[PDB]
Amino acid sequence: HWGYGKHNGPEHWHKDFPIAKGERQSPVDIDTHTAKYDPSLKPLSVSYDQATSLRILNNGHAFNVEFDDSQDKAVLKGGPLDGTYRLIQFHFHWGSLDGQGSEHTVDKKKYAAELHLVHWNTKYGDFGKAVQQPDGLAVLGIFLKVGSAKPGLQKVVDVLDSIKTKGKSADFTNFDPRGLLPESLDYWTYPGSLTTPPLLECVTWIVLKEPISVSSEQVLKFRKLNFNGEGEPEELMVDNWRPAQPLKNRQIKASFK
Ligand code: NA
Ligand SMILES: [Zn+2]
């Protein structure tokens, strides 16, 4: 019954998921002046040319665009990562107004939304086994600010009418996630967790420094989605973000000088 409301939101999650108070929880605030440049970090290799999207699903918390991860098509490697991580899905977190919505913050700044491209380490064979490992996942996080429209996002925006409520899905083939990337791949990285229950501490976070711009109209359509199922009282899907969590004994590294 976890969600984002007063009675089931982030402040309650620890009761069913005690790791919510663990040692490597996400998201965090990125304090830009103390994130040291690490010249040993490699350029990020984002290889999405062969990505096969399949479907888009409203899961009652966000919407997921799902990919065929049965072969090494769309993969992330390099950067802080050892080996190869396969893209399984992407989703967003966003706010009720433009001044909040992101999960990570940058010098306490909240962006209007945040895109998460979720990948699993192929050395573990399946996603379910990967989430039993401290290096099982790599999530590429990209901030969204409101300004000019993002052309590569419009196909997502236009299908949302068909998945308004929890449990609805639609065929979503031939979507190219390269259209959601900014120009620069400069990033910050740190070890963390899933930002929704079960909050598992599996994730190498890679957060890009450069936001993408989306239009007010694009994010307004996100905010017309529903957390509820069909036939139930309408609860707009907004403010589906977890606030920043204590950094504890971690360092955030920058890929850029
Ligand atoms: Na530091
Ligand atoms: Zn997420």
Curated annotation (Swiss-Prot):
Domain of life, per lineage: Eukaryota
pH dependence: Optimum pH is 6-8.
EC nos: 4.2.1.1, 4.2.1.69
Consequence recorded when altering H61A: Reduced CO(2) hydrase activity, rescued by 4-methylimidazole (4-MI). Reduced proton transfer. Enhanced proton transfer. Enhanced proton transfer capacity
Reactions performed catalytically: hydrogencarbonate + H(+) = CO2 + H2O; urea = cyanamide + H2O
Effect of W2A: Impaired activity, not rescued by 4-methylimidazole (4-MI)
Catalytic residues identified in the record: H61 (proton donor/acceptor)
Associated pathology: Osteopetrosis, autosomal recessive 3: A rare genetic disease characterized by abnormally dense bone, due to defective resorption of immature bone. Osteopetrosis occurs in two forms: a severe autosomal recessive form occurring in utero, infancy, or childhood, and a benign autosomal dominant form occurring in adolescence or adulthood. Recessive osteopetrosis commonly manifests in early infancy with macrocephaly, feeding difficulties, evolving blindness and deafness, bone marrow failure, severe anemia, and hepatosplenomegaly.
Enzyme superclass (EC): lyase
Keywords: Acetylation, Cell membrane, Cytoplasm, Disease variant, Lyase, Membrane, Metal-binding, Osteopetrosis, Phosphoprotein, Zinc
Name of the protein in its database record: Carbonic anhydrase 2
Residues where Zn(2+) binds: H91, H93, H116
Effect of H116E: Strongly reduced activity
CDD domains: alpha_CA_I_II_III_XIII
Function in brief: Catalyzes the reversible hydration of carbon dioxide. Can also hydrate cyanamide to urea. Stimulates the chloride-bicarbonate exchange activity of SLC26A6. Essential for bone resorption and osteoclast differentiation. Involved in the regulation of fluid secretion into the anterior chamber of the eye. Contributes to intracellular pH regulation in the duodenal upper villous epithelium during proton-coupled peptide absorption.
Consequence of changing L194A: Reduced CO(2) hydrase activity
Cell compartments where the protein resides: Cytoplasm; Cell membrane
CC cofactor note: Zinc. Can also use cobalt(II) with lower efficiency, but not copper(II), nickel(II) and manganese(II).
Cofactor: Zn(2+); Co(2+)
Site (Involved in the binding of some activators, including histamine and L-histidine) residue list: Q89
